[PDB]
Each structure stands twice: as C-alpha cells, then as structure tokens.
C-alpha cells in the first residue's frame, strides 16, 4: 500500500510516534518519504548483502530476520516479512527500538541526507491531525 502524507502522519500518531523520545512527527514523515516514498512494500538490496524492508526501510542485518542475511542480530525480534504489512504497527514499533540506541534518527541514511537540517514541520502542514 502507498500512503498519503497526512494519512501516514495520522497512522504513526495512532502508534505513539508523535514526539516519541523527542522526535517530531514531521521527521518521521520526512524519513518515510525519502526512504520508501510512502510505499509499505518497498524492498531494497544493499551492496553489503543486507536488505532494507518496508515504509521505514528497516535493515535485515541488525533489526529484523529475513532468513537470508548472515550475522543478523534481529534486535527487534521480528521477521522482516512482517515489516511489509499494510498495517505499519510492526515497522513503527521496531523504529522505536532503533531510535533508542543512541544514533537517534541518523540511523536512517535517507533522513540524514534529505531531512536533517530542514523544516520537517512542513511535512505535517495541512493535515487534519
């Protein structure tokens, strides 16, 4: 499923992402935009053999187990195939564990290069949240 800017913002809000650990909803929406273009089925193979899954592009090397990535730590204790659902619950809850480690949202390569240092508040503008 491909979400809409405001539709995603509300969905993330329904699962406690709004201001989670100090990270504004704008940042999360901006991250999803450049990471998967709001597509819950987005899957991208990286040069190191790992794959990023879902609307938040969660890596199979550290966070989820796709059964095809050697040395997978699976810190979110969940199969990567669960991150492709139309319901973003699993993805959102794994993201919560990710931003708690200590790298903040820098863990998201697209976010760090496209969102960081910009007015991410614009991403939730015009939304009926």
């Amino acid at each position, epitope marked *: 499923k491909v979400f809409g800017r405001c539709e995603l913002a509300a969905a993330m809000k329904r699962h406690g992402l709004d201001n989670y650990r100090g990270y504004s909803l704008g940042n999360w929406v901006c991250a999803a935009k450049f990471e998967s273009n709001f597509n819950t089925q987005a899957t*991208n193979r*990286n040069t*190191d053999g790992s794959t990023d899954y879902g609307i938040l592009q969660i890596n199979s090397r550290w966070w989820c187990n796709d059964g095809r990535t050697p040395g997978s730590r699976n810190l979110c204790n969940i199969p990567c195939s669960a991150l492709l659902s139309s319901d973003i619950t699993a993805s959102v809850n794994c993201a919560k564990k990710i931003v708690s480690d200590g790298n903040g949202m820098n863990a998201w390569v*697209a976010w760090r290069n496209r969102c960081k240092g910009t007015d991410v508040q614009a991403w939730i503008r015009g939304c009926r949240l």
Partner: nanobody
Amino acid sequence: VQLVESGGGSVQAGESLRLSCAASGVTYKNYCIGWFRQAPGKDREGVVFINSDGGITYYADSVKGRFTISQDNAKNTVYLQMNSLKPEDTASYYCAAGYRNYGQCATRYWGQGTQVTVS
C-alpha cells in the same frame, strides 16, 4: 530520479560489452550510483559503484580487473565496461542509485534492468 539502461545482448565468452545508464536527478547529497547483477537462481548482488567524490568501490571480487565503471558528466551517463565475458556473467544487470553509507551504497532507486547472456 530516473534511471534508464541500455546495451544488453548475447555474446560469446571472451568478448566485451558496454552497458550504459542514463540518469536524471542523481544530484542529491552523498549519492552513490552503480550496478547490481542477478544471475538465474542467485540473489541480486552488488558489482561496482562510484560515489559523489569520485571514489570507486567493488563488491564482486570476481569482476575486478575485468569490469570498469566510468561516468560521463557531459551526458549524465554512467557506464559499465565488461571485458573478458564468461558464461557465469550471464545475468540481468541493474543500474541503481542510493546514499553513501560508510563504504556501502544504500540503494533506493532502480533502473529497469538489461539482460546479458554469455554462451
């Protein structure tokens, strides 16, 4: 971002082929662009990439010395020169772009793919 490939074909071992990837919009911060390959029955694997600073990194050790990557700014095109082709090189070749991530390229954009068959 748009990536369009061309140049695929069917050749005999020993010959050479050059693939091209015409790209638009790959000007964002810390981009990396390169080629992936997926042979029948195998997983899609990275081949070679170039980053925004001109650095080139190989991900498939078996292609080192045989495959070369080059970028032609004047034509916003990236090339993959494939020399001494072997039957094992048979595969679908994809142009891909992403973000630099400490030596790796986190891919987020893909071309349509082109087939290269080596007999």
